[PDB]
């Protein structure tokens, strides 16, 4: 090489018959749990092409779908995964640019996931190869809306919060009494047993909010005084749950429950426990009112 420079008499080889598809899972809550699921990608001959001497409709692949898989254990990781399409076995009859469309298939929709609807046009440049004595997929160019770009799909993972509050009313209500509660989050296919969600308890005085963890499929015990709350801060969407307060009728309390989703319709339950609710993308506030009079 010139002076102190170092000369490499060739290059790193790129496989011009293979196309990488990248999945980026975009978390609205950076602490979100990662659901067990696939993302599927399909490649199809582009029908919209004007078939002249150089441009061709793509030749259909034998395996026109590929996928990436996510599991609960990916949490904390990069949340980027790759798959690949292979064009090496595709028989091209003549040199040309062969056009395909690459999309993400939203077949099994996961609660709280927003699916990328991007459609990439992919040009497979197929050049005559003197060695192999045939037309060969030589390089691949993909583009979205007027820039040649790596093929990436970006799916968004939303999650939610559940806030449980205690309110004491009546002239007989003890505002310094601790009421006992249980929270159960039920496991499903997306989020298995023992995965943990984050819980913050706020008390009304000088102490800062306290952090704890609750396991899916495991009863979580907590207490609340009037005007205190807990908040599940990274509750996944699609998760069934029950909140119950102990029975305080023998201590002369009446208990009612208010189930209030953010922009939704408030729900009043005379009694002691929520139904089995299912978490949605809306923040849920559940208030237990304990009333005592003379």
Swiss-Prot record:
Topology relative to the membrane: Peptidoglycan-anchor
Modification after translation: Proteolytically processed and assembled in pili through a transpeptidation reaction catalyzed by the sortase C1. The last pilin subunit is cross-linked to the peptidoglycan.
UniProt-listed InterPro entries: DUF7601 (IPR055382), Sortase_SrtB_sig_QVPTGV (IPR017503), Strep_pil_isopept_link (IPR022464), Strep_pil_link_sf (IPR038174)
Site (Autocatalyzes isopeptide 179-303 formation): 245
Matching Gene3D superfamilies: 2.60.40.3050, Collagen-binding surface protein Cna, B-type domain
GO CC terms: extracellular region; pilus
Superkingdom, natural source: Bacteria
Outcome following mutation: residue 104 to A: Increased susceptibility to proteolysis
Site for Autocatalyzes isopeptide 36-168 formation, residues: 104
UniProt cross-link Threonyl lysine isopeptide (Lys-Thr) (interchain with T-311), position: 148
Subcellular location: Secreted, Cell wall; Fimbrium
Record keyword Plastid present: no
Keyword field: Cell wall, Fimbrium, Isopeptide bond, Peptidoglycan-anchor, Secreted, Signal
Crosslinked positions (Isoaspartyl lysine isopeptide (Lys-Asn)): 23-155, 166-290
Oligomeric form and interacting partners: Forms columns of about 3-nanometers in diameter of head-to-tail-assembled molecules.
Function recorded in the entry: Major component of the pilus. A stack of the pilin subunits, joined by intermolecular isopeptide bonds, forms the pilus. The pilus is required for bacterial adhesion to host cells, for bacterial aggregation, and for biofilm formation.
Family: Belongs to the Streptococcus pilin family.
Protein name: Pilin
């Amino acid at each position: 090489g010139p002076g102190s420079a170092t000369t490499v008499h060739g290059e790193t080889v790129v496989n011009g018959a293979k196309l990488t598809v990248t999945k980026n899972l975009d978390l609205v809550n950076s602490n979100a749990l990662i659901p067990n699921t696939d993302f599927t990608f399909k490649i199809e001959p582009d029908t919209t092409v004007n078939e002249d001497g150089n441009k061709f409709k793509g030749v259909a692949l034998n395996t026109p779908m590929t996928k990436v898989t996510y599991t609960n254990s990916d949490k904390g990781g990069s949340n980027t995964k790759t798959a690949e399409f292979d064009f090496s076995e595709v028989t091209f009859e003549k040199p040309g640019v062969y056009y395909y469309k690459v999309t993400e298939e939203k077949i099994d929709k996961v609660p709280g996931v927003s699916y990328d609807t991007t459609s990439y046009t992919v040009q497979v440049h197929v050049l005559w190869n003197e060695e192999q004595q045939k037309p060969v997929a030589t390089y691949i160019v993909g583009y979205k809306e007027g820039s040649k770009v790596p093929i990436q799909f970006k799916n968004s993972l939303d999650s939610t919060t559940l806030t449980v509050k205690k309110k004491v009313s009546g002239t007989g209500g003890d505002r310094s009494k601790d009421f006992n509660f249980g929270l159960t989050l039920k496991a499903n296919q997306y989020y298995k047993a023992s995965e943990k969600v984050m819980i913050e308890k706020t008390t009304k005085g000088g102490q800062a909010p306290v952090q704890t963890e609750a396991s899916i499929d495991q009863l979580y015990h907590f207490t609340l005084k009037d005007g205190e709350s807990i908040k599940v801060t990274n509750l996944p969407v699609g998760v069934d749950y029950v909140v119950t307060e102990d029975d305080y009728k023998s201590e002369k309390y009446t208990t009612n429950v208010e189930v209030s989703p953010q922009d939704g319709a408030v729900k009043n339950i005379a009694g002691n426990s929520t139904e089995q609710e299912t978490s949605t993308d809306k923040d849920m506030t559940i208030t237990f009112t304990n009333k005592k009079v003379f």
